[PDB]
Amino acid sequence: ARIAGVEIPRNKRVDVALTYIYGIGKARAKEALEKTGINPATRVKDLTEAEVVRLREYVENTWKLEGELRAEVAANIKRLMDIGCYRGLRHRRGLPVRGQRTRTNARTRKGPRKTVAGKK
Amino acid sequence: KIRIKLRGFDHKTLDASAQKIVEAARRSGAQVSGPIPLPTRVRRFTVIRGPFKHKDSREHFELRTHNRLVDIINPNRKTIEQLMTLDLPTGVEIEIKT
């Protein structure tokens, strides 16, 4: 059942299936299946096309989702380029931005590993 | 019925000096709700033995506050005879309550 943007989650419980949208977590799902009264337990497979529309229009007009987020969040960061706040050169340099160490670790933000040598 | 409490770091000179409040309110007095021991409260201190790096090897100190309780059921002044000033504590504290 196509919902946000283009998403076709299917054959799993809507509450989980809902998750497969950029902008839906287990939180925003619990809401939609109560502020639109749909059993979360039911598979998308067997699910009324009246319930799909109550959903599709709720979620899509309740909050900014999927690819708008993506392009906001992206433009939201290049904002921090601005004149050059700290988190600027940090995203700019690709190093941890939330004040954590860097002597060791920081492997998630620094891709894999680029190793070197030393001395005699 | 009269309430006095007795704290102390020393376990021997409490049961002793509060069997003094037993006898000096037994001789001159009457019926006794005996010495009952509240549980003790141990303040632990753990310290590394060395001035410098030696994170293992430490020593262990405690400061056990023994607590002993004593009440008696004849509030007369024919009891506050010795219990006026007839003192052999040293570092016991007293809490005379109502």
Binding site: - | T46, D56, R58, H60
Partner: protein, 127 residues
């Protein structure tokens, strides 16, 4: 009319009152199998009875505090034995072979400084 023993095991203690009759056993305002419910080893606690054929021709009101369930089970087990030999002091020279009469000294041994966990020692590295 009444017989009793004190069971203990690993900071867990059991007041155990025996009576003859029926087969019911009370523990802390609850039936046995509601308190020790779905805990396989519970039935061990009454192997004293099952030894001497006291079986369920006894009732037992048992309060118990200290520990966790499986300590209590062994504690009760000790009370049941320490009670029913206080009913029949001849009920001793048959609970010796099974040894249902021994406190079981095993308790949490102390955590030591410079270890991690009593015996567990921290990790070596050499180089």
């Amino acid at each position: 009319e009444q017989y009793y023993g004190t069971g203990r095991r690993k900071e867990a203690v059991a007041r155990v009152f025996l009576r003859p009759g029926n087969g019911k056993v009370t523990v802390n305002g609850q039936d046995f199998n509601e308190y020790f419910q779905g805990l396989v080893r519970a039935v061990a606690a009454l192997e004293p009875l099952r030894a001497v054929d006291a079986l369920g021709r006894f009732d037992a009101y048992i309060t118990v505090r200290g520990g966790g369930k499986s300590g209590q089970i062994d504690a009760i087990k000790l009370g049941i034995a320490r009670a029913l030999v206080q009913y029949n002091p001849d009920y001793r020279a048959k609970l010796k072979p099974l040894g249902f009469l021994t406190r079981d000294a095993r308790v949490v041994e102390r955590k030591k400084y410079g270890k991690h966990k009593a015996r567990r020692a921290p990790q070596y590295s050499k180089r």
